[PDB]
Design a protein around this ligand. Sequence first.
Ligand code: HEM
Ligand SMILES: CC1(C)O[C@]2(C)CC[C@H]1CC2
Length: 397
Amino acid sequence: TSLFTTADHYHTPLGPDGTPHAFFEALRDEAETTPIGWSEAYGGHWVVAGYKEIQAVIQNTKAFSNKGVTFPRYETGEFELMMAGQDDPVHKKYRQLVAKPFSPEATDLFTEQLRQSTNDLIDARIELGEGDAATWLANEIPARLTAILLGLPPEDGDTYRRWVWAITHVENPEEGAEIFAELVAHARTLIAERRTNPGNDIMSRVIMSKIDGESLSEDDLIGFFTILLLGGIDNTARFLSSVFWRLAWDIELRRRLIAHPELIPNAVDELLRFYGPAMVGRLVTQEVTVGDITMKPGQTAMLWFPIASRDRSAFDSPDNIVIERTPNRHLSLGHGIHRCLGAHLIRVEARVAITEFLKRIPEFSLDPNKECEWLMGQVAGMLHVPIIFPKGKRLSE
Ligand code: HEM
Ligand SMILES: CC1(C)O[C@]2(C)CC[C@H]1CC2
């Protein structure tokens, strides 16, 4: 009996705790014998579970193309994801356009506004003594951050979330395409507006940019817009929700982060290893052998990062969250040329999220009368995290 045969990142068996982690652990155990397995899901594809096997695939850009980065493909109409859905040299040229504003020295400029924002969000419910940490904080912190990066109105998080849902989760493909078409319409307007009155934001920047003497097509710009929006409203929101969930019941982890704030960055790294929501696909472009398996052009490999992150040959006590873990060479933010662009910014954002929350609400728990909900997908993490806590006081009247 092989767990690879019906492995499906959108349909992962959930254990009693609410998460797919029992299943991830079982699959990790099997992968010690079989690091790469065939799944009959999505018409048939390779599932890459072993840590060193994922490293081998991800370093091989000659045989594995990022044209298959989403599998099954995200609903983005005729548009593609900039950087993430491209290979070199096209890929490298586009990333260079936004390398500078995503560098650590540039993104640190947001840190104090991130603290203020997180605190203002906490204000909204602290007097109430209950709330969904996902909808209330985990979703909102990166949505607002993302809106600032894209030069969008920060109060329209619900609109941006509807678009993201269409791209990633809506099942009816007519609706999904229709709703992605709305994004495109809003994106065209914004681009036209930044064209005449540019600002400091990333969109303004890329609109004013030039590759090989030529300005980018509108479709390219829409691609930039789309992936950046995804990085925030999907990936970060789900990661932060899972973290809030863990802190809600794991009183031992919680008291330590409060007692050792100097440990928070390292714990964020460990949390990324443990609750890293993402998996990515690769399109096989030439015959290639990895370990025991020979893959063929046209086939797709899903890189199951969460399983690699629990590989006993790469991490000691992989099933434990050890906040002092170092080094921690997890794959939650990718590796190689497609390594997460947000990287340092997401670390700072997670650090601030956690620090201010524990500072304001050091005691809380899961709501016994409302259900948690895990969202399965290529990006997987908690969607609803209802909590209760002793009523507090706002900082800002
Ligand atoms: C917890 C939050 C996040 C996680 C877990 C995550 C995960 C990842 C992973 C695993 C990759 C590798 C893709 C591959 O190998 O094909 C990647 C790439 C990428 N990420 Fe994210 N991400 C997060 C947040 C963000 C944010 C906030 C942004 C931007 C605002 C962003 C922008 C990008 C871009 C542009 C790429 C492609 C870079 C390239 O192709 O060179 N991400 N991400
Ligand atoms: C899952 C992940 C990491 O996020 C996006 C936005 C970028 C790369 C892939 C696919 C889509």
